[PDB]
Paper text:
Among these, Cullin-RING E3 ubiquitin ligases (CRLs) stand out as multi-subunit complexes comprising the Cullin scaffold subunit, an adapter subunit, a substrate receptor subunit, as well as an E2-recruiting subunit RBX1/22,3. The ubiquitin ligase function of CRL3s is activated through dimerization. In contrast, the BTB-containing Kelch-like protein 22 (KLHL22) plays important roles in mitosis, T-cell activity and amino acid sensing. CRL3KLHL22 ubiquitylates several cellular substrates, including serine/threonine-protein kinase PLK1, programmed cell death protein 1 (PD1), and DEP domain-containing protein 5 (DEPDC5).
To provide further evidence that deletion of the CUL3 NA motif impairs assembly of CRL3KLHL22, we resolved the cryo-EM structure of the CUL3Δ1–24-RBX1-KLHL221–178 with 3.9 Å resolution. We also found that about 6% (5070/79349) of particles exist as dimer states, suggesting that the KLHL22 dimer can also recruit two CUL3Δ1–24-RBX1 molecules. We speculate that the CUL3Δ1–24-RBX1-KLHL221–178 may exist in a state of dynamic equilibrium between the (CUL3Δ1–24-RBX1)2-(KLHL221–178)2 state and the (CUL3Δ1–24-RBX1)1-(KLHL221–178)2 state, with the equilibrium favoring the formation of (CUL3Δ1–24-RBX1)1-(KLHL221–178)2 due to decreased binding affinity between KLHL22 and CUL3Δ1–24-RBX1. The first indicated a molecular weight of 155 kDa, which corresponds to one dimeric KLHL221–178 (calculated molecular weight 41 kDa) binding with one CUL3Δ1–24-RBX1 (calculated molecular weight 100 kDa).
Residue numbers in the entry:
A (entry chain K): 31 to 43, 45 to 71, 73 to 84, 86 to 89, 91 to 113, 115 to 146
B (entry chain L): 24 to 33, 35 to 57, 59 to 73, 75, 77 to 83, 86 to 93, 102 to 110, 121 to 142
C (entry chain C): 26 to 279, 282 to 333, 335 to 389, 391 to 398, 403 to 495, 502 to 564, 588 to 627, 629 to 636, ...
D (entry chain R): 21 to 36, 51 to 58, 65 to 70, 77 to 81, 92 to 95
Amino acid sequence: QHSQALLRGLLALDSGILFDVVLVVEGRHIEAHRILLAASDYFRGMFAGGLKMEQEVLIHGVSYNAMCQILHFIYTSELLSLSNVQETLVAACQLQIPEIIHFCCDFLMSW
Amino acid sequence: NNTYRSAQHSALLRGLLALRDSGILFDVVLVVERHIEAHRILLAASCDFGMFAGGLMEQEEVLICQILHFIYTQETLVAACQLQIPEIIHFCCDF
Amino acid sequence: DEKYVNSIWDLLKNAIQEIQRKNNSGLSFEELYRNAYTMVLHKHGEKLYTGLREVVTEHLINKVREDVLNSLNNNFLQTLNQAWNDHQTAMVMIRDILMYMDRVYVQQNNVENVYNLGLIIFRDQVVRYGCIRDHLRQTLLDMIARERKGEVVDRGAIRNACQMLMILGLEGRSVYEEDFEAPFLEMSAEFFQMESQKFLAENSASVYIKKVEARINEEIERVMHCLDKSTEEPIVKVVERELISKHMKTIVEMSGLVHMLKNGKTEDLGCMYKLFSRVPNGLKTMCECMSSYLREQGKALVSEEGGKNPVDYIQGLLDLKSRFDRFLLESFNNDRLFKQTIAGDFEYFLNLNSRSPEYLSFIDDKLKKLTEQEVETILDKAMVLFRFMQEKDVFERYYKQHLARRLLTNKSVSDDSEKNMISKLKTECGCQFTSKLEGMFRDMSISNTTMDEFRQHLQATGDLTVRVLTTGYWPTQSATPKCNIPPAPRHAFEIFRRFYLAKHSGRQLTLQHHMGSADLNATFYRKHILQVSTFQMTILMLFNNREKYTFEEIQQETDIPERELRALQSLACTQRVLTKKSKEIENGHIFTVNDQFTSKLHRVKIQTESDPERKETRQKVDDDRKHEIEAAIVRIMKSRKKMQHNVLVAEVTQQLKARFLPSPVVIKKRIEGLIEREYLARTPEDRKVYTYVA
Amino acid sequence: RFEVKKWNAVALWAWDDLCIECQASEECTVHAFHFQVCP
């Protein structure tokens, strides 16, 4: 439960604090925690594995719709709407999280 | 509809520990007495920082081992009393 | 578009050069991943994988080989180590950028991951190379060789080197095995063989074993420290052989086991015991060499000198047992094989002596008057020796004879001491043997009871001491001499005889006059209390008739066997007690009454097996065994009508070995006698098979 | 002069043993035969 409590606190940092990293997938500047992102593997390789480490971040690629759900998942482990599924799968291929890929596949199977 | 969920992040917390072992992205460095780099994000979440988030941010080398370990994964009793953490309290009481 | 992916691949590959080289910046990782991400989606991810492999190989050939070759002169290991660290670092970071390919295309194409691929390239272009590997292997051999000589070397470098080989081996360890592992084992092997050859010059067992044990610890350390455990296990086996197996028997005779046996060096033997305990058949060769010595020493003890004191003979063997028992307790750590070795050794030389049972029957000397506990342990040791003996029946007969003597003379320290010996005999023998001894005790209970009954009879009707003997239980001269008895004692015996006839119906009184003495008086200048055999008593009675009595003359009237009339030679004995020749007994020897004999005490007892006795006693043993097996064979032949000769002799000897080992050749003769006496009947199908005939 | 005194007579008394049946028990004991009417 300690890891879960720590996790809850990490995202609560929801308090507009420690949001050193700023993701940009479509010109829009959304905020995120660099170290916390480096715990979840595109982000892991974005900073710790990144060479220009100077990303505190232009993801570009997929749209924010999918990325918003991707971020909504990496925080509090909660992903996936009927209108927001295929793009999330594509975004789940950019970020190394198969959970979202699996989730979208099951959702597509369902609908 | 069925928005599926998975709390496997419990490799988020694991990665933060490996990040510590890799000695990388150490936003802060704790001056034990000697220095020991740490991550304010985990510190603030583990114990409420107030301190780091309370701008107490001008101190890159904040001046101060059993606690830090537990976070990412006699004196301990005193530290737990000083910094109230229920899990550490229970562990030290059991020990 | 293929040109688009080509251009984006070039950008990614140019950035890959950066990720691979020490400098790592000047680019946005996201772009790089995007390149790889799009390429995989554009069916060019595997194309990128091959290109990545190409630059990885190029780096490990152009930016590595030359660098480590510049260090062929010196610090090759350190330069190679640094290159390995740099390579591994480059592999993980390029992997953390080309991870998407591993995420889908690498597992799809069923190929290895970026890092795995990089390591394979390294163990093909750098490590495990045509020459670089050998340079590393030899320098590691040189490193451990100096470590063997004690030359302080950088064990960290050796450890890093071997560990690096393990990492290159990945899932397997073949890399290290074919790089330094096998060379180290053979190099260490000759290292120990040279050490053992150098030791062969010292020719001293103790220091050899001590430093050999130290070598085991020191060598195994050199391994678990910088050569890990993969090479340690083989070493534990290699050093043990190249240092000890070659001298498995050499060390035994080099100080030496027998040297330790002679000086009772239990501490040195303990080290040798442990040295060969970890050696296959190491204890075996030590045991057989020890048994060889024990055989020699025990045979020397068994070998008679003149004949030797039965007490000393048994005690010598008891002392021999105690020494090796302590050796097993300490040096051989109660090893079961060593125990079995010593046990068989004693069973061997002990039986070589047929007088061993007679000599052990030692027990009589102990029973014939240390504390009770010390005596008990002495009896126990003799019992342990009796166990080694196969002549159980012979010992029982000899002991029961001595027991009967002590019982008749009622001089045993305590019947309880006898009871204990009898009980111990029962544990190591049959109830038959015990019943004989038990019956002897019952007889004594009757004798003392009947004696008082006769005394009560004397009082009722208003110093004879009859000792009734139970037939069988007590062995007696086949033929009682039936000599005349002094009238007064004889008349009194007639009264006890008629008393016993009435008291015990269907029971006679065969007087064994030869057994028993009396308080005979004799003129001595005054009389004296002389303890003489009933035979010597009748002689003095003749002296009452005639002071001058000749050997033959006394026989003509006492009716005593000329040989037993012994009595006259003992009575004369040496003319103090009686004047006859001083000791030699002959017919022409006339005996004159002697009064010169005297003593401070009025009571003076008068002195009263040899080749003849021992011979007849052993013949009795043989005759008993003869009838014994004959009966046993018929018994089982009756139980199992059909019994094949070999089967019959096998079961018979097996069921009888407990008390004695029946000789099969004589068994067959007795078996043929049983065949003649109906019973065994040779079958037409197999004469060996015998059918029982009531 | 030489008169015998306190004579320790030793007389082996004899029947004046287990029957074949028992010989081939000890508890069993002896027209006298060792071990429903007398024969």
